[PDB]
Every structure is written in structure tokens, then in C-alpha cells.
Design an enzyme around this catalytic site. Structure first.
Site, PDB file in Angstrom:
ATOM      1  N   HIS A  72       1.317  -0.896  -0.229  1.00 33.93           N
ATOM      2  CA  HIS A  72      -0.306   0.212   0.053  1.00 33.93           C
ATOM      3  C   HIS A  72       0.903   1.553  -0.144  1.00 33.93           C
ATOM      4  O   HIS A  72       0.960   1.838  -0.663  1.00 33.93           O
ATOM      5  CB  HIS A  72      -1.015   0.102   1.099  1.00 33.93           C
ATOM      6  CG  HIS A  72      -1.991  -1.253   1.185  1.00 33.93           C
ATOM      7  ND1 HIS A  72      -3.303  -0.759   2.104  1.00 33.93           N
ATOM      8  CD2 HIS A  72      -2.165  -2.090   0.095  1.00 33.93           C
ATOM      9  CE1 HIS A  72      -4.207  -1.694   1.391  1.00 33.93           C
ATOM     10  NE2 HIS A  72      -3.813  -2.571   0.430  1.00 33.93           N
ATOM     11  N   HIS A 224      -8.763  -0.554  -6.242  1.00 34.87           N
ATOM     12  CA  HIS A 224      -8.007  -1.201  -5.040  1.00 34.87           C
ATOM     13  C   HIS A 224      -6.681  -1.845  -5.338  1.00 34.87           C
ATOM     14  O   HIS A 224      -5.840  -2.035  -5.356  1.00 34.87           O
ATOM     15  CB  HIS A 224      -8.622  -1.541  -3.949  1.00 34.87           C
ATOM     16  CG  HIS A 224      -8.024  -1.919  -2.694  1.00 34.87           C
ATOM     17  ND1 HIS A 224      -7.515  -0.648  -2.306  1.00 34.87           N
ATOM     18  CD2 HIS A 224      -6.679  -2.680  -2.725  1.00 34.87           C
ATOM     19  CE1 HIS A 224      -6.680  -1.734  -1.174  1.00 34.87           C
ATOM     20  NE2 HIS A 224      -6.274  -2.293  -1.618  1.00 34.87           N
ATOM     21  N   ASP A 228      -3.218  -1.633  -5.695  1.00 37.91           N
ATOM     22  CA  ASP A 228      -1.614  -2.904  -5.014  1.00 37.91           C
ATOM     23  C   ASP A 228      -1.350  -3.388  -6.674  1.00 37.91           C
ATOM     24  O   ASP A 228      -0.500  -3.547  -5.751  1.00 37.91           O
ATOM     25  CB  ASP A 228      -2.847  -3.452  -4.249  1.00 37.91           C
ATOM     26  CG  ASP A 228      -3.258  -3.415  -3.061  1.00 37.91           C
ATOM     27  OD1 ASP A 228      -3.678  -2.538  -3.239  1.00 37.91           O
ATOM     28  OD2 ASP A 228      -3.604  -4.537  -1.871  1.00 37.91           O
ATOM     29  N   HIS A 251      -1.176 -11.168  -5.328  1.00 39.26           N
ATOM     30  CA  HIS A 251      -0.023 -10.222  -4.836  1.00 39.26           C
ATOM     31  C   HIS A 251       1.076 -10.978  -4.981  1.00 39.26           C
ATOM     32  O   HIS A 251       2.315 -11.172  -6.138  1.00 39.26           O
ATOM     33  CB  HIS A 251      -0.090 -10.433  -3.490  1.00 39.26           C
ATOM     34  CG  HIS A 251      -1.232  -9.142  -2.883  1.00 39.26           C
ATOM     35  ND1 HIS A 251      -0.540  -8.693  -3.122  1.00 39.26           N
ATOM     36  CD2 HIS A 251      -1.960  -9.423  -2.475  1.00 39.26           C
ATOM     37  CE1 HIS A 251      -1.299  -7.107  -2.882  1.00 39.26           C
ATOM     38  NE2 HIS A 251      -2.738  -8.290  -1.968  1.00 39.26           N
TER      39      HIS A 251
HETATM   40  C1  LIG Z   1     -18.932  -8.773   8.130  1.00 35.00           C
HETATM   41  C2  LIG Z   1     -18.116  -8.133   9.121  1.00 35.00           C
HETATM   42  C3  LIG Z   1     -16.351  -8.626   8.780  1.00 35.00           C
HETATM   43  C4  LIG Z   1     -15.980  -8.083   9.889  1.00 35.00           C
HETATM   44  C5  LIG Z   1     -14.762  -7.222   9.232  1.00 35.00           C
HETATM   45  C6  LIG Z   1     -13.551  -8.478   8.146  1.00 35.00           C
HETATM   46  C7  LIG Z   1     -12.524  -8.713   8.034  1.00 35.00           C
HETATM   47  C8  LIG Z   1     -12.217  -9.547   8.152  1.00 35.00           C
HETATM   48  C9  LIG Z   1     -10.429  -9.707   7.759  1.00 35.00           C
HETATM   49  C10 LIG Z   1      -9.558  -8.690   6.357  1.00 35.00           C
HETATM   50  C11 LIG Z   1      -9.329  -9.419   5.799  1.00 35.00           C
HETATM   51  C12 LIG Z   1      -8.488  -8.682   4.632  1.00 35.00           C
HETATM   52  C13 LIG Z   1      -9.936  -8.527   3.976  1.00 35.00           C
HETATM   53  C14 LIG Z   1      -9.844  -8.472   2.502  1.00 35.00           C
HETATM   54  O1  LIG Z   1      -9.701 -10.327   1.846  1.00 35.00           O
HETATM   55  O2  LIG Z   1      -8.631  -8.079   1.504  1.00 35.00           O
HETATM   56  C15 LIG Z   1      -8.627  -8.483   0.164  1.00 35.00           C
HETATM   57  C16 LIG Z   1      -7.205  -8.219  -0.695  1.00 35.00           C
HETATM   58  C17 LIG Z   1      -6.512  -7.960   1.214  1.00 35.00           C
HETATM   59  C18 LIG Z   1      -4.883  -6.645   1.752  1.00 35.00           C
HETATM   60  O3  LIG Z   1      -6.008  -5.043   1.724  1.00 35.00           O
HETATM   61  N1  LIG Z   1      -4.948  -6.592   1.321  1.00 35.00           N
HETATM   62  O4  LIG Z   1      -2.781  -5.550   1.720  1.00 35.00           O
HETATM   63  C19 LIG Z   1      -6.583  -8.252  -1.097  1.00 35.00           C
HETATM   64  O5  LIG Z   1      -7.274  -7.952  -2.660  1.00 35.00           O
HETATM   65  C20 LIG Z   1      -8.451  -8.905  -2.148  1.00 35.00           C
HETATM   66  C21 LIG Z   1      -9.313  -8.981  -3.914  1.00 35.00           C
HETATM   67  O6  LIG Z   1      -9.322  -7.417  -4.217  1.00 35.00           O
HETATM   68  C22 LIG Z   1      -8.976  -8.094  -1.130  1.00 35.00           C
HETATM   69  O7  LIG Z   1     -10.032  -9.266  -1.151  1.00 35.00           O
HETATM   70 ZN   LIG Z   2      -4.435  -4.640  -0.824  1.00 37.01          ZN
END
Ligand SMILES: CCCCCCCCCCCCCC(=O)O[C@@H]1[C@@H](CC(=O)NO)CO[C@H](CO)[C@H]1O
Ligand SMILES: [Zn+2]
Length: 268
Positions: A72, A224, A228, A251
């Protein structure tokens, strides 16, 4: 020319997967220094070769030190063309904040400084195709940096593609990371996303949006992903120039493209 920060900058916030409070400090460096992280008295250059663990996030680590989610910030730096900066990372991962780079892009953009040296841009001279995990990515030489991403979602969003071109960076910095309620459990089963929340993680439902603010862009989630994909291409440590396309890319697969590109141009 080489770009550095005019004044020291700093940020603070919990980490998405670590869910622990972390803080980052950025200080100016000497021209041609590059992007390097510092912690526990240990410097860790930000380059693909330093890739120690690839997963839903990009992690780098050296001398036994490791940092998670560094793509990021690297993405914002890539768009701003930052060549010399020492980011001290206190903690084990870069704070997720809202989930986008708008915060780093907003403050740093107002604190950028110009140095006295010409930057060495990285240009692709030969194409390449990498297929894996049912995903695929292609690179092609070009005089301008362009990256296209084709995401296939089974939710109401269906399939969506977003083409990024030099001059449209403002549309890929406010896109915060996102996730689906069906894959969340999996990410949680792997001991990751302990800091993931609705304030820092946009969760979408097969046909409903969890966040009450809705989507910020008809293509926010793919914006996003493209944001990324760049953060992973900046691992070369220098602005990348060429036309890249990515279909359901991840990734690791992304880093692979950089690995072959950096190992292929090794002769020159
Ligand atoms: C319903 C209530 C739910 C409570 C809160 C949920 C929290 C989930 C835990 C967070 C894990 C990351 C979420 C995720 O899968 O985002 C992914 C992202 C990951 C990333 O940012 N990598 O840097 C990478 O790209 C893919 C696709 O673009 C995204 O899906
Ligand atoms: Zn991400």
C-alpha cells in the site's frame, strides 16, 4: 529528478492482519538512496528480492526482521515518484488506517521536495506472460505506464475491469481494500485479518453492502486491486514504464511478474 520529503512525516494506526497498534516515521535521505525501512536498528531495503512472504498482503524482511502489508505505502510512493525516503516502521506491519493510500498521498503530496539528480526509470523492452492458480498477467513494452485489471466477482457487481493510465492516479488512491463475507471466514481461518474492520476493510455481500456509505466508485474494489498491482511493481525500486494487464491476479503472481522482469533485464 530525485524526490524526497521536505519535512519529517509520521502516521499511527492498527494493522489489518496484526490488529496491533503500529506507527511509521519518514525522514529525508540522500539522492539515489531508494526506499528503505528501519526498525530495531536494522535497515531493510524495499525491493522484490527482499520478498520473504507473499499472501493476501506483501511482506518484506531481512536479518530476521519482517514487515507485513508494505505494498500500500509503496503504491503511493510509486505514483508520487519518491526515490529517497527512510520509513521507520515501529511494529510488525504498516497501519491499515482507512484501507486506502489517500491519507499517505494527502499528507506526503503536501510535503514532497525536489532534489538535484535524474531518476533512472524502469522500462519494459520485452513482453511476458505468467499463468498460475487460474490467474494470468501479461506485460508489454510501452512509453507510458498503464495497468489494466479484469476482476470477476460472483456477487451483484459481477465482472468489472479498470484501466489505469498516467494522469488518472487520483482514481486509484482513494480505493480502500475490500473483502467478501464468504471469503472473510477463510482469511480469518488462516489467522489473518485480526485488525480487519468495517472502518478499515470494505466488506461486500453477495447482493448487499455492509458499510453504510456504499461504494465510493462503481469500480472501487477493482480500483484498489490496480492500486495494489502497482505497489507490487514498484518493488523494482523505480517507476515502472510499460503496458501491463492482469486477469484475476494475486500478490504472489504479481511479484512473479516483477521477479522475471527484474531477472530478465539482468543482462542490462
Ligand atoms: C461482516 C463483518 C466482517 C468483519 C470485518 C472483516 C475483516 C476481514 C479480515 C480482513 C482481511 C482482508 C480482507 C480482504 O480479503 O481484502 C482483500 C485484500 C487484502 C489486502 O488488503 N491486502 O493488502 C487483497 O485483495 C483482495 C481482492 O482485491 C481483497 O479481497
Ligand atoms: Zn490490499
Amino acid at each position: 529528478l530525485e524526490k524526497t520529503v521536505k519535512e519529517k512525516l509520521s502516521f499511527e494506526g492498527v494493522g489489518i492482519h496484526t490488529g496491533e497498534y503500529s506507527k511509521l516515521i519518514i525522514h529525508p535521505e540522500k539522492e539515489g538512496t531508494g526506499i528503505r525501512f528501519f526498525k530495531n536498528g536494522v535497515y531493510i531495503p524495499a525491493r522484490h528480492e527482499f520478498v520473504v512472504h507473499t499472501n493476501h498482503s506483501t511482506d518484506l524482511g531481512f536479518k530476521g526482521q519482517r514487515i507485513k502489508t508494505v505494498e500500500h505505502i509503496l503504491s503511493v510512493l510509486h505514483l508520487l515518484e519518491i526515490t529517497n525516503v527512510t520509513i521507520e516502521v515501529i511494529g510488525n506491519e504498516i497501519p491499515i488506517l482507512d484501507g486506502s493510500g489517500w491519507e499517505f498521498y494527502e499528507a506526503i503530496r503536501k510535503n514532497i521536495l525536489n532534489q538535484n539528480r535524474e531518476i533512472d526509470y524502469f522500462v519494459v523492452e520485452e513482453p511476458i506472460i505468467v499463468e498460475d492458480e487460474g490467474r494470468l498477467i501479461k506485460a508489454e513494452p510501452s512509453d507510458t505506464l498503464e495497468v489494466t485489471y479484469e476482476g470477476e466477482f460472483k456477487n451483484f457487481l459481477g465482472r468489472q475491469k479498470f484501466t489505469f493510465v498516467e494522469g488518472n492516479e487520483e482514481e486509484i488512491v482513494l480505493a480502500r481494500t475490500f473483502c467478501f463475507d464468504w471469503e472473510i471466514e477463510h482469511i480469518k481461518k488462516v489467522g489473518l485479518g485480526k485488525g480487519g474492520s468495517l472502518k478499515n476493510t470494505l466488506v461486500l455481500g453477495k447482493d448487499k453492502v455492509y458499510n453504510p456509505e456504499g461504494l465510493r466508485y462503481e469500480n472501487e474494489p477493482v480500483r484498489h486491486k490496480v492500486f495494489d498491482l502497482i505497489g507490487d511493481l514498484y518493488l523494482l525500486g523505480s517507476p515502472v514504464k510499460g503496458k501491463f494487464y492482469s486477469f484475476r491476479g494475486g500478490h504472489s503472481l504479481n511479484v512473479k511478474l516483477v521477479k522475471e522482469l527484474a531477472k530478465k533485464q539482468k543482462l542490462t
